[PDB]
Amino acid sequence: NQIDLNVTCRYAGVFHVEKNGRYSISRTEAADLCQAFNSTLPTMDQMKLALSKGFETCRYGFIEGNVVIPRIHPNAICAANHTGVYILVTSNTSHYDTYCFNASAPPEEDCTSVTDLPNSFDGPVTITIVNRDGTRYSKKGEYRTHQEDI
Numbered sequence: 001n002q003i004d005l006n007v008t009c010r011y012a013g014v015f016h017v018e019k020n021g022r023y024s025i026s027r028t029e030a031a032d033l034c035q036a037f038n039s040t041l042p043t044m045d046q047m048k049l050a051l052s053k054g055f056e057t058c059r060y061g062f063i064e065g066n067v068v069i070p071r072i073h074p075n076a077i078c079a080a081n082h083t084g085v086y087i088l089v090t091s092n093t094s095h096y097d098t099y100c101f102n103a104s105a106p107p108e109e110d111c112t113s114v115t116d117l118p119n120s121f122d123g124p125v126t127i128t129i130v131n132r133d134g135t136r137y138s139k140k141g142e143y144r145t146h147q148e149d150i
């Protein structure tokens with residue numbers, strides 16, 4: 001009973017979370033997951049400010065109201081070579097990664113590791129936060145409040 005959460009640097013408090021190495025998060029699960037990091041789904045304005053501080057990924061993830069990819073450098077295989085906050089328009093499917101916003105994070109680029117899941121609740125799952133540098137933090141608990149996500 002294990003969940004891996006790969007996380008990035010934070011940029012103006014915004015970061016990306018990929019669950020179990022695949023697109024696997026629903027919109028309801030994403031809100032609950034960010035809540036476990038004392039965070040919320042970013043607004044489009046919060047995401048645009050994060051982009052301006054250096055944030056880019058090559059993965060679709062939820063923000064409030066849309067599914068996006070923040071892009072700085074044009075790359076043919078990331079958001080069809082677009083720059084800026086690329087908004088997904090047409091898709092058949094509902095599962096993606098998520099972005100989260102922590103208002104207590106530093107204002108600009110914070111590439112230190114994440115070493116806690118401060119607001120997870122009691123539960124049976126071994127949840128492991130995996131940083132890009134490989135460092136890991138694990139705790140037994142749960143964050144999903146909707147039975148359909150479990």
Ligand SMILES: Cc1cccc(C(=O)NCC(=O)O)c1
Nearest residue numbers: 010037102104105106116118
């Ligand atoms: C768990 C998490 C995710 C992203 C960012 C942070 C963070 O810098 N918090 C500072 C604080 O709580 O005072 C924590």
